[PDB]
Amino acid sequence: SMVPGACPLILRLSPTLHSADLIRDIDAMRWFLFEDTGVPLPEVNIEVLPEPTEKLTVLLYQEPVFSLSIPAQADYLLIGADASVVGDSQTLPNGMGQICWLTKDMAHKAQGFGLDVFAGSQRISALLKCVLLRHMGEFIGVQETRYLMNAMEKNYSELVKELQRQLPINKIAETLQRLVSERVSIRDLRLIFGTLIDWAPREKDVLMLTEYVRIALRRHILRRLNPEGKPLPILRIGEGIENLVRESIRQTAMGTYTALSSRHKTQILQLIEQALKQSAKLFIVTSVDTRRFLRKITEATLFDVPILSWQELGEESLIQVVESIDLS
């Protein structure tokens, strides 16, 4: 008893909406998260609250980040879809999306528009999943990279045994973290390990190895952003900002970080945020030698905002320059 080591993931439910064949739903949820994003997740212990408040809490390493109260009338949960039908709209914490509760007739009407709607137990799964995608970078450390590299040795022994003698594990783990953080799938381990073996002796910076590994997954990146090959509602950055960041980066040579002028950071942030309010959804483009720093700036907010570059863009990808930036 009193063993050290917190519990990874645990779900607290009121017994009014419990054991409605929830186990199968959460299984089928994680068995799909795995093949969607590669990271394998741990089992989900479920706790029963002797409570009347019909509440649910999802505790992450014995510390809470999601807790919601479901009204009695709630049913036929819809999640952040179009405003065609509005039964009851709601906003989630930390900007994790918006939900909407629907009536049966409104649910059928929504289904008519080709959307999807959940009811019964599957609403719990579709909400838990929405919670997890926001916190996928938590389940990748020095101890899970080892599990992946031990699973591989079944069929790729001579590849991992050759990757090991080029990098220490505490850099492979960092690279995988930097990748899965930006919602880039890592299910193709063969290609990542190959690209890491190629460039390892020529470079000792994980922050650069990540960029090189990122260039090589153009198909696996674009196929997800732009199904059926539609033109990209892109944006662009201003040459002044590009140059400013360019000289700021070299301000330090060893740490490889950029000296920050808040009297430029703040303006860049506000100007970008205002520009996105024009409904230019995603696909901010930038120079190759700055994308990492640009994402470093934004990650504090506006998460789920892709920051691509020209190298990740195919020679014949269909483009529409919808906006441009003037600050300098």
Numbering used by the authors: 345 to 672
Quote the paper.
The protein at the heart of both T3SS secretion and secretion specificity belongs to the SctV/FlhA family (injectisome and flagellar system names respectively). While only injectisome members have been given unified Sct names, the SctV/FlhA family is conserved across all T3SSs of both flagella and injectisomes, which assembles early into the inner membrane, and is central to T3SS assembly and function. SctVC’s substrate specificity is mediated by a trimeric “gatekeeper” complex formed of SctW (in SPI-2, SsaL) and a heterodimeric chaperone (in SPI-2, SsaM and SpiC, lacking unified Sct nomenclature).
In the SPI-2 T3SS, SctV is often referred to by its original species-specific name SsaV; here we call it SctVSPI-2. To better understand the role of SctV in SPI-2 translocon-effector specificity switching, we purified full-length SctV and determined its toroidal cytoplasmic region’s structure using cryo-EM. Central to specificity switching is a nonameric SctV protein with an N-terminal transmembrane domain and a toroidal C-terminal cytoplasmic domain. Structural comparisons and molecular dynamics simulations revealed that the cytoplasmic torus is stabilized by its core subdomain 3, about which subdomains 2 and 4 hinge, varying the flexible outside cleft implicated in gatekeeper and substrate binding. Simulations suggest that a local pH change from 5 to 7.2 stabilizes the subdomain 3 hinge and narrows the central aperture of the nonameric torus.
